Amino acid sequence: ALEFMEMEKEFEQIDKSGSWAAIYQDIRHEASDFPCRVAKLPKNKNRNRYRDVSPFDHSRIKLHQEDNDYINASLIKMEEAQRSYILTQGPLPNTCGHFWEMVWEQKSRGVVMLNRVMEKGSLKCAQYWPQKEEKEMIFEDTNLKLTLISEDIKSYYTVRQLELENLTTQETREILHFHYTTWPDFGVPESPASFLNFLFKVRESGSLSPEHGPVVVHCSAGIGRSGTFCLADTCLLLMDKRKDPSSVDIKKVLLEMRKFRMGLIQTADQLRFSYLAVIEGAKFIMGDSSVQDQWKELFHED
Numbered sequence: 055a056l057e058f059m060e061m062e063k064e065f066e067q068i069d070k071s072g073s074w075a076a077i078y079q080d081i082r083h084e085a086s087d088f089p090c091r092v093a094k095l096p097k098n099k100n101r102n103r104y105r106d107v108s109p110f111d112h113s114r115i116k117l118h119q120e121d122n123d124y125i126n127a128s129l130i131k132m133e134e135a136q137r138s139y140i141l142t143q144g145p146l147p148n149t150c151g152h153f154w155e156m157v158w159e160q161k162s163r164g165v166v167m168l169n170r171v172m173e174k175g176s177l178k179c180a181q182y183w184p185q186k187e188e189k190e191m192i193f194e195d196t197n198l199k200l201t202l203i204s205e206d207i208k209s210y211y212t213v214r215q216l217e218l219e220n221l222t223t224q225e226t227r228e229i230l231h232f233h234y235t236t237w238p239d240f241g242v243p244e245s246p247a248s249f250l251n252f253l254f255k256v257r258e259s260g261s262l263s264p265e266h267g268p269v270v271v272h273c274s275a276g277i278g279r280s281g282t283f284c285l286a287d288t289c290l291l292l293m294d295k296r297k298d299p300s301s302v303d304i305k306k307v308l309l310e311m312r313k314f315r316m317g318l319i320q321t322a323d324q325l326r327f328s329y330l331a332v333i334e335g336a337k338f339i340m341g342d343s344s345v346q347d348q349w350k351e352l353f354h355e356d
């Protein structure tokens with residue numbers, strides 16, 4: 055009856071010894087370092103939100119425009135898990151057209167937003183989507199029209215249906231916007247329940263299906279919260295796919311992902327939270343008594 059997951063035993067040992075900072079720093083020491091020459095070009099200075107957060111040249115997403123193909127976004131391709139994600143920074147006042155151009159060109163079905171437009175009294179990203187059905191947005195620079203079709207506000211997240219039209223061809227597509235609205239201004243969530251439920255909602259939408267382009271995920275820099283979302287998702291998927299689930303090593307998965315975008319998971323607390331999310335998510339998926347009750351009731355409805 056009683057059996058701890060291997061990462062559960064690891065988690066307890068790290069927690070008991072108070073070594074999250076040491077564990078996290080080792081991951082930082084071992085992380086890949088690749089050039090980001092395009093990102094650093096003078097003409098792209100206003101396309102980057104932070105000088106210290108850039109996409110590697112080898113995995114960056116290229117816009118299909120002869121002028122400037124640059125956008126601060128990276129393709130994270132997880133072979134084994136058979137999952138792909140585009141991690142990007144929150145759009146800037148001048149990169150909203152590029153953002154939606156990327157969504158269009160990459161054939162993405164979903165956009166996952168993990169920050170609020172304003173946090174800690176500052177703007178974390180531009181208001182890049184329409185807030186009223188009757189007030190659509192037109193991005194002149196990339197010739198795209200974006201319309202709010204519907205929106206459903208829940209206590210921990212909001213899901214919006216958006217229609218994106220390429221004005222050049224008049225083709226239209228429906229994009230689902232999954233907005234996690236409750237990550238605290240400081241630190242990480244006390245419990246991974248709502249974040250996990252949110253991940254399950256994005257999964258259920260079909261947005262992560264290999265039949266669509268990669269889901270686009272962003273927070274402010276596109277590495278912290280965004281990194282936790284993809285890391286948790288990929289670890290859980292691997293645990294369901296492998297013959298030996300206890301072989302899934304979150305640290306190894308995180309390093310693999312860091313081969314495609316720098317800085318994924320920005321603090322030791324975010325690492326600890328990622329462990330908590332995977333552990334609790336794995337137990338829920340495994341039909342565990344405790345996790346299910348406290349979930350169905352409050353985590354779901356109410």
Ligand SMILES: [Cl-]
Pocket residue numbers: 172173174175176
């Ligand atoms: Cl604020």
Ligand SMILES: [Cl-]
Pocket residue numbers: 168169178273274275278279
């Ligand atoms: Cl953020």
Ligand SMILES: [Cl-]
Pocket residue numbers: 082316317318319320
């Ligand atoms: Cl880092």
Ligand SMILES: [Mg+2]
Pocket residue numbers: 083084085086087
């Ligand atoms: Mg090295």
Ligand SMILES: [Mg+2]
Pocket residue numbers: 186187
């Ligand atoms: Mg109205």
